[PDB]
Amino acid sequence: ILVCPPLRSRAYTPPEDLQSRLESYVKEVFGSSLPSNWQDISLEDSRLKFNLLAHLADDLGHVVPNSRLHQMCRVRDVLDFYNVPIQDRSKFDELSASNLPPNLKITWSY
Amino acid sequence: IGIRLTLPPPKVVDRWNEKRAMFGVYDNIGILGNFEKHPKELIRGPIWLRGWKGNELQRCIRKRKMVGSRMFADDLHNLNKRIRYLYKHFNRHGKFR
Amino acid sequence: TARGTPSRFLASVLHNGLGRYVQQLQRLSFSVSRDGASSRGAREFVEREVIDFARRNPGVVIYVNSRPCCVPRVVAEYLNGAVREESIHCKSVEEISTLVQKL
Amino acid sequence: PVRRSEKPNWDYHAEIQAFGHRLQENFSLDLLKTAFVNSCYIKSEEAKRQQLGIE
Amino acid sequence: EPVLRKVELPVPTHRRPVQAWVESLRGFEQERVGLADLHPDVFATAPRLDILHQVAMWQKNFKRISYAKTKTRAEVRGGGRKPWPQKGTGRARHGSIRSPLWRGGGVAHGPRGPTSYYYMLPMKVRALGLKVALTVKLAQDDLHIMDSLELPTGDPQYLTELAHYRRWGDSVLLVDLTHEEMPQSIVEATSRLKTFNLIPAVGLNVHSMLKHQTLVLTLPTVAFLEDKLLWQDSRYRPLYPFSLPYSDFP
Ligand SMILES: [Mg+2]
Ligand SMILES: [Mg+2]
Ligand SMILES: [Mg+2]
Ligand SMILES: [Mg+2]
C-alpha cells in the first residue's frame, strides 16, 4: 500500500544562492534581527536547532549526521558543512572516469 | 602417501544462526539488571564446574567432592587413581622447587 | 646448488644496448580483490601509483582485473615470450612498487 | 599453443599503441593496423562468413 | 510536533553533551522526527579498542566449557602385565602395552575431562566496554535512536525495505525495554528476519553490537543505558553484593 519508494543518491552539490537561502531560513525560524552577525548566532536551544537543520535537510536533500551534529554550535558551522560537496559514485566508476593512460585497462568481476 | 586426492566437501557456515545471532545476549545482566543475576549463572555444564576454573588436580578433587558419591564404580576408581597420580606429580616432580 | 640447478651464459635478448635500448617488459596483469585483507596493498597501489607507472613507461600494457581472490598477483610478460608471476599477497605499497619497478 | 589474442588479458588497440611507443617511433595507427593485416587472414574471414551465411 | 530529549543525569561542568537525530519506524520516510542529546561520558568516551577486545574476548571465553577428554595409560583397557620379559630377547624394554608409545595406548598429554574457562573482568571494566561500544557506534554513524519501534503493517519485508532505503546496513540490532512492552508489530516483523535482531535493553552486549552493523535504540533505552552505565562511576566500594538493600540502590 506504500511499497518501495525509489532510493536517493548521496551526491550533493551546494547551489549558488546558498548564502541567501541560509539567510532566509534563519530569519523564518528566528524572527529576530540581522544587525551585526547573522553568521554568528548560536544553537544551544535544541528546538530552533532542530527546526533550522530539518528545514535545511528538507530543502537541500542533505542531512547532517550525528557525529557532525554534535559539533554544530554556530550557524557558520553548518554553512561550512554545506560546502563539502561529496559524490556518491563508486570508486570503480571514478577510477574509470579519471584520465587513464591509453596503456591501462580495468576490467571488473562484480 | 598421506594427502587426500580430492577436495573435501565444501563446508557452509550459517553465520546468522539463531545461536550465532543471539550469542552474548543477556550477558551483562548483573551490570544492567540491578545485580539480581550474576553472569556466572548463565553457564550450563557439569555441576562441579559452573563458575569455577581450577587446575586439573583441582578439577579432579572438586569433581570427587561434589559428585563422587553418585559416580560409577570404575569411574570413581579411575578418579581416585588420577588424583593420587596428580598429587604425586604436582607435589614431587618437575623443575622449579 | 649449481650442480643441482640449470645454468646459462650472460646474454642480451636482441642486442639491446647496441642500437636503441628497448624496454623488455611487455605486460603487467594485476589480480586484485575488491574485498579482502590480503589485497589492501594492491588496492592502494592501484589507487595511487599504477597510473603514474603507466604514464612513466608507455611501452608496457597494464591490466587490472579486480576479481575475488585470496592471493592477489602480478604477472609480468616479456618481449621474448617469458612469463613471470609474482604474489603481492599481504604486501605494503612500497613493497609492491619496488616489485613492479624491479619487474 | 594458442594465440596471445585468444588469452584473457588482451586489448588490441592498447597493444598496438604500446608496440609503437616501445621502439620510440611515431607510427600512423591506421597504417600500422594495415601493416599487421594479412591476405590469408582476409580470405579465412570471408570464407567463414560465407559458410555461416552472415553478411 | 517536535520531540526534544535532554539528559536528566548531571553532565559535568565541561564536556557539553552530544546530539543525535530522533527517528521513527511508523512512516517509511519519517526521519528527523525530533532531536535528542546524549551524555558525553557514555556516548563520547575514548575509543578504547583495547577495552573492546578485552570485553569481546571475555564474552567469548568465560562461558566456554570444553568436554574433550582422552584416556591416559591407566584408563585404557588391559595393559596390566609386562610382555616379553626385560632382559631375554632382542626387543625394546616395555612394561605394559597401552603405554603412549604403543598403537592403542594411552595419550600422554591429551585433553583431560571437562575443562572450564571461567574468569570475570571487573564490572567497571565491562561497563567501560559497553560505554566504549556505544561511543564507537555513535562516532561511526552506526547508531540510530527512535522514539518507539512501531510499524503500521508489521511484516518483515517492510522493515527490510525501510532499512535498505535508510541505508542502515545489512545487520541491525534493535534494542527495546523490559521485553514486555515490545509491540506486536515489531515482534512479528523481526521474528522472521535473520539479520534483524530484537533484544531488550538488559541484553545489550559488546559482542552483539560488534556483530551487527547498526544499532537502533529507543529514547527510554537511551535513558536506561545512560543511568545504568553512569552508576558505575561515583559509586562506593561494594562492602557486600549489590543484590542486597543498599538504601538508595533500587
Ligand atoms: Mg592398570
Ligand atoms: Mg635386534
Ligand atoms: Mg612399568
Ligand atoms: Mg586409543
UniProtKB/Swiss-Prot annotation, chain A:
It is found in: Mitochondrion. Its main location: mitochondrion. One of its GO terms (biological process) is mitochondrial translation. Keywords: Mitochondrion, Ribonucleoprotein, Ribosomal protein. It comes from the Eukaryota. GO terms for cellular component: cytosol; mitochondrial inner membrane; mitochondrial large ribosomal subunit; mitochondrion. The keyword Mitochondrion applies. Component of the mitochondrial large ribosomal subunit (mt-LSU). Mature mammalian 55S mitochondrial ribosomes consist of a small (28S) and a large (39S) subunit. The 28S small subunit contains a 12S ribosomal RNA (12S mt-rRNA) and 30 different proteins. The 39S large subunit contains a 16S rRNA (16S mt-rRNA), a copy of mitochondrial valine transfer RNA (mt-tRNA(Val)), which plays an integral structural role, and 52 different proteins. Belongs to the mitochondrion-specific ribosomal protein mL50 family. This is Large ribosomal subunit protein mL50. The chain holds residues 49 to 158 of 158 of the full protein.
Curated annotation (Swiss-Prot), chain C:
Component of the mitochondrial large ribosomal subunit (mt-LSU). Mature mammalian 55S mitochondrial ribosomes consist of a small (28S) and a large (39S) subunit. The 28S small subunit contains a 12S ribosomal RNA (12S mt-rRNA) and 30 different proteins. The 39S large subunit contains a 16S rRNA (16S mt-rRNA), a copy of mitochondrial valine transfer RNA (mt-tRNA(Val)), which plays an integral structural role, and 52 different proteins. This is Large ribosomal subunit protein mL43. The gene is MRPL43. Belongs to the mitochondrion-specific ribosomal protein mL43 family. It comes from Homo sapiens (Human). High relative levels in skeletal muscle and testis. Lower levels of expression in the heart, brain, placenta, lung, liver, kidney, pancreas, spleen, thymus, prostate, ovary, small intestine, colon and leukocytes. Expression is coregulated with TWNK. Coiled coil: none annotated. It is found in: Mitochondrion. The chain holds residues 2 to 104 of 215 of the full protein. It comes from the Eukaryota.
UniProtKB/Swiss-Prot annotation, chain D:
It is found in: Mitochondrion. It comes from the Eukaryota. It is linked to Combined oxidative phosphorylation deficiency 16: An autosomal recessive, mitochondrial disorder characterized by hypertrophic cardiomyopathy, liver steatosis, and decreased levels of mitochondrial complexes I and IV in heart and skeletal muscle. Component of the mitochondrial large ribosomal subunit (mt-LSU). Mature mammalian 55S mitochondrial ribosomes consist of a small (28S) and a large (39S) subunit. The 28S small subunit contains a 12S ribosomal RNA (12S mt-rRNA) and 30 different proteins. The 39S large subunit contains a 16S rRNA (16S mt-rRNA), a copy of mitochondrial valine transfer RNA (mt-tRNA(Val)), which plays an integral structural role, and 52 different proteins. Belongs to the ribonuclease III family. Mitochondrion-specific ribosomal protein mL44 subfamily. Component of the 39S subunit of mitochondrial ribosome. May have a function in the assembly/stability of nascent mitochondrial polypeptides exiting the ribosome. This is Large ribosomal subunit protein mL44. It comes from Homo sapiens (Human). The lineage of its organism: Eukaryota, Metazoa, Chordata, Craniata, Vertebrata. The gene is MRPL44. The chain holds residues 57 to 111 of 332 of the full protein.
Swiss-Prot record, chain E:
It is found in: Mitochondrion. One of its GO terms (molecular function) is RNA binding. Residues 74-105 are annotated as: Disordered. Transmembrane segments: none annotated. The modification Omega-N-methylarginine is found at residue 103. Its main location: mitochondrion. One of its GO terms (biological process) is mitochondrial translation. It comes from the Eukaryota. Keywords: Methylation, Mitochondrion, Ribonucleoprotein, Ribosomal protein. GO terms for cellular component: mitochondrial inner membrane; mitochondrial large ribosomal subunit; mitochondrion. Belongs to the universal ribosomal protein uL4 family. Component of the mitochondrial large ribosomal subunit (mt-LSU). Mature mammalian 55S mitochondrial ribosomes consist of a small (28S) and a large (39S) subunit. The 28S small subunit contains a 12S ribosomal RNA (12S mt-rRNA) and 30 different proteins. The 39S large subunit contains a 16S rRNA (16S mt-rRNA), a copy of mitochondrial valine transfer RNA (mt-tRNA(Val)), which plays an integral structural role, and 52 different proteins. Interacts with MIEF1 upstream open reading frame protein. This is Large ribosomal subunit protein uL4m. It comes from Homo sapiens (Human). The lineage of its organism: Eukaryota, Metazoa, Chordata, Craniata, Vertebrata. The gene is MRPL4.
